């Protein structure tokens, strides 16, 4: 079973520099493509960013335009989210999921995820 | 709906390759051209110095 976990969550002002972390032990981080999830409060779920495995490339949605950059983590097999510049429409908790095995591309829907982690809260205020 | 009830277009690539006359390729870009200069040069029959 995978302990998929994923922590660093606070209230912050506009434009604060907070990361994320995910955990990922039992399968394999090292090969796995893998994305980034939230569940918008009176929305629906929505991607957030992705990679693949020796980050040769990179892909986010339409309003995370110059918010985000996704890297790897190899100490530990951990991705981070370096993100900036908030937005007040940002809160929700983070998760990062798992996919089969990749050779190249982008992909970004919820539910081609088949797994999903503990998450965190994010927030933003002005 | 959500994501999972929203309609999906979907198009994928399937690549015959098998040796034949192969009519489709990808589009190949060309170097400026220089003149009266010792140069390393590159022609789609041939290559040479």
């Known amino acids: 079973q995978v302990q998929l976990v994923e922590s660093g969550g606070g209230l912050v002002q506009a434009g604060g520099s907070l990361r994320l972390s995910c955990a990922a032990s039992?399968?394999?981080?090292?090969?796995?493509?893998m994305g980034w999830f939230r569940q918008a409060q009176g929305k629906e779920r929505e991607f957030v960013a992705t990679?693949?495995?020796?980050?040769?490339?990179?892909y986010y949605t339409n309003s995370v335009k110059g918010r985000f950059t996704i890297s790897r983590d190899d100490a530990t097999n951990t991705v981070y989210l370096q993100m900036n510049s908030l937005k007040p429409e940002d809160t929700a908790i983070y998760y990062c999921?798992?996919?089969?095995?990749?050779?190249?591309?982008?992909?970004?829907?919820?539910?081609?995820?088949?797994?999903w982690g503990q998450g965190t809260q994010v927030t933003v205020s002005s | 709906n959500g994501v999972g009830y929203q309609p999906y277009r979907v198009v994928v690539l399937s690549f015959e390759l098998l040796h034949a006359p192969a009519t489709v390729c990808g589009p190949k870009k060309s170097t400026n051209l220089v003149k009266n200069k010792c140069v390393n040069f590159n022609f789609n029959g041939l290559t040479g110095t």
């Open positions: 039992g399968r394999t981080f090292s090969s796995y493509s």
């Open positions: 990679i693949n495995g020796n980050g040769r490339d990179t």
């Open positions: 999921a798992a996919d089969k095995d990749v050779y190249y591309g982008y992909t970004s829907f919820p539910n081609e995820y088949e797994y």
